[PDB]
Amino acid sequence: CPLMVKVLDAVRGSPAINVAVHVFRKAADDTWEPFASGKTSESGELHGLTTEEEFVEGIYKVEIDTKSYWKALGISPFHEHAEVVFTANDSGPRRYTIAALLSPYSYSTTAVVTNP
């Protein structure tokens, strides 16, 4: 649907399961208002965060709680979390996949944006 987060573990070559993800939307007063949250599945994906109607134009932040993920695996990683910030739907509704590839001292994040 309109916003999906996918997380992979580059150490094990596997989905990153049970990763907490918090989504925020910037308000007109400039604060970050909570928008949605959840955790990744067995497949490393988190679906169902929002609907096209709810997912209006705005600046969004996707915070992925990578530190908690590594700590549960016995690892003390470098980053507190990964934060992905972007304008969405400024030229009409799109579908966003926010992917993150995780390693203890590194991550990458990519967006796949498609027109429904």
Next chain:
Amino acid sequence: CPLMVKVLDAVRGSPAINVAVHVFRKAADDTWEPFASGKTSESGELHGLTTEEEFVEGIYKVEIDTKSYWKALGISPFHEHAEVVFTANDSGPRRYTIAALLSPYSYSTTAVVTNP
């Protein structure tokens, strides 16, 4: 120089030059206080941000102003900026290089943490 930031451009295969970087330290009230800032050099590097005396244990955020970089180059970017958030810890290595590899719709960031 306990903290350096290095930014590369994956489209042009070059250092990312003149990228604004802002560094923040987390205050006790959970807000981000400005701490240091600069623009990357012709080698994509930003040095001289802080000193070992003032770079005490705490949580820091490095914000790299990727959107402006791509706008200057005439390429549509996805992210507002790249954020790197981490804890500084005296027990470990005392030189932190925050590296970022930029593409319009993806970035990676890595910490190279060493002793001298």
Next chain:
Amino acid sequence: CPLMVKVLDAVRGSPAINVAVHVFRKAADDTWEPFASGKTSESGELHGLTTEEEFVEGIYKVEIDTKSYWKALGISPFHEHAEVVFTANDSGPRRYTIAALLSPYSYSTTAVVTNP
């Protein structure tokens, strides 16, 4: 199925479509024997390369023809192709997803390996 290749374009934030992919398997005489080939779909994926029965233990090479991809978009990229080489099925049959994220002067490749 047992081997899938997924390719993304980090410039556009989209699947990399119509990318040629050639798979090779190392023979006992040490040469690279052609094993399968195809091109990525509208979704950037290439499925149907092999079956579990055909996909025996071996060292495989997945060559992704990234240069042809960029050239068709007007770009002169750095790499001739991306080549991904790995042992497969040495502890029994697994499912492999070979992902590649492409930029003109950079790529990343990741494997997601699951036990059916």
Next chain:
Amino acid sequence: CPLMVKVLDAVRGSPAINVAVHVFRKAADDTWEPFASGKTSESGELHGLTTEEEFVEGIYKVEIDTKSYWKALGISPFHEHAEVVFTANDSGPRRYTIAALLSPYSYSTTAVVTNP
């Protein structure tokens, strides 16, 4: 020094030290002739591979022996090695840095190509 290779370790957040690297040039019969080799230094770098006189236009392959690196560290890796294949072109910039960021099940590689 027209060619340098730099390797980083995304698990430990460090230079990848003592990684074997072999460089090849494509011969007119389409085979790979050995050209240079070395191990990365304590800074993850390999210099002195060739000279501008002998580094003529052609297609080169840089093979980074990632599997051995991870084996030494006691972590199961995916890839046999990382291969980087590119054409050297006199018309452009004349210093090539081949950078590789390593995780057990993923790697990225980037070319930083500059003039001095």
